[PDB]
Structure 1
Amino acid sequence: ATFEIVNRCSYTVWAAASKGDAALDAGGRQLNSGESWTINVEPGTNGGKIWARTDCYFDDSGSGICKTGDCGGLLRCKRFGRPPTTLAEFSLNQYGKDYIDISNIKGFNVPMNFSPTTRGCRGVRCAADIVGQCPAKLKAPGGGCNDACTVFQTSEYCCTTGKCGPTEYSRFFKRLCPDAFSYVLDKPTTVTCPGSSNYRVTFCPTA
């Protein structure tokens, strides 16, 4: 499957793509404002994620630090990034179907649109100013808006027992972005697409 990753933000982001135990394609790349990066993701990929990282510094060796979404100090991510990270999530060719979603379960750092470039399903988007509106206790100094599980580490926020309800904090994410997961047991906003669809992830889709 082909993913075009487009940075429409006015600032540089460092895109990342991983399935948790391995990079997807190169795993990461600098994207200046306006730049697009096309990656190939192998069919059948389960649990892939794409996200943006902000305010990164890397050296010759691709080692460094990002203020949001850092994946163990590497330019080319092999693991998932440190919250807060708006997440484009996907599982491809699962019994003839692709499944895509945007999740705020790990917080929010950059607005995002996640859309197919082929026929047969809708895209999803979380483009509200969640950082600007972020509740005081969830604001991350590095930038972005943490989820409540990351901040407070309780069974209720992290849904550790498999039973949990919405919270004041999850409802904030849900109010601004109804089409993204706001907590683990949120009513699914997953979109079902034809197997082997192609996609575009756009950072800052509106502004």
Structure 2
Amino acid sequence: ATFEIVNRCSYTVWAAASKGDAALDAGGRQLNSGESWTINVEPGTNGGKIWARTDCYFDDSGSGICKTGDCGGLLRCKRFGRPPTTLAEFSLNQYGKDYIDISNIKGFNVPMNFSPTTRGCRGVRCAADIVGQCPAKLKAPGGGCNDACTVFQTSEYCCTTGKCGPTEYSRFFKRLCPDAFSYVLDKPTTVTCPGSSNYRVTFCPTA
């Protein structure tokens, strides 16, 4: 499948694409304002994630630091990135269907639109100013808005026992962004697409 990743933000982002144990395609790339980066993702990929990193510095060998979304200091990510990270999550060719979603379960840093470029399903969007509105105890100094589980490490926030309810903190992400997961047992906002669809991930779709 083909993913076009577009940076519409006015600032530079360092996109990243990973399935947890390996990179998807090159795994990472600088995107200046307006730049598009298209990648091939192998069919059948389960649990692929795309996200943006902000305020990065890398050297010639591709080692550095990012203030949000860092993946162990590498430009080409092969593990997932450190929160806060708005997440585009996808599993492809699962019994003939594609499943996509946007997640705030690991926090928010960049607003995002996740849409198919082929026919037969809707896209999802989380474009609200969650960083501007972030509750005081969730603001990450590096920028962005942490999820409650990252901040507090309790069983209720992390849903470690498998039973948890919504929280004051999750209800905040849900009220600004209904189409995104706010906690792990949230009512699914997964969208089902025809198998082998193609997609575009757009950072800062509104402004």
C-alpha deviation, 1:184, in angstroms: 0.3
C-alpha deviation, 1:67, in angstroms: 0.1
C-alpha deviation, 1:198, in angstroms: 0.1
**Local SS of the residue matching 2:170:** helix
C-alpha deviation, 1:40, in angstroms: 0.2
CA distance in 2, matches of 1:20, 1:44: 15
CA distances 1:157-182 after superposition (whole Å, capped 9, x unpaired) = 00000000000000000000000000
CA distance in 1, matches of 2:146, 2:64: 22
C-alpha deviation, 1:119, in angstroms: 0.2
Q: Compute the RMSD of aligned alpha carbons.
A: 0.1
CA distances 1:72-130 after superposition (whole Å, capped 9, x unpaired) = 00000000000000000000000000000000000000000000000000000000000
**Local SS of the residue matching 1:121:** coil
CA distance in 1, matches of 2:106, 2:38: 25
C-alpha deviation, 1:152, in angstroms: 0.1
TM-score (structure 2 length as normaliser): 1.00
CA distance in 2, matches of 1:146, 1:27: 24
C-alpha deviation, 1:13, in angstroms: 0.0
CA distance in 1, matches of 2:102, 2:46: 15
Identity level (%):
100
C-alpha deviation, 1:204, in angstroms: 0.1
C-alpha deviation, 1:192, in angstroms: 0.1
**Local SS of the residue matching 1:93:** strand
**Local SS of the residue matching 2:54:** strand
- Corresponding residue for residue 98 of structure 2: 98
**Local SS of the residue matching 1:105:** coil
CA distance in 1, matches of 2:153, 2:36: 36
Aligned residues: 207
TM-score (structure 1 length as normaliser): 1.00
Provide structure 1 residue ranges, at least 5 long, that are not aligned to the other structure: none
C-alpha deviation, 1:188, in angstroms: 0.1
CA distances 1:39-71 after superposition (whole Å, capped 9, x unpaired) = 000000000000000000000000000000000
C-alpha deviation, 1:25, in angstroms: 0.1
C-alpha deviation, 1:156, in angstroms: 0.1
CA distance in 2, matches of 1:138, 1:20: 25
CA distance in 2, matches of 1:205, 1:137: 27
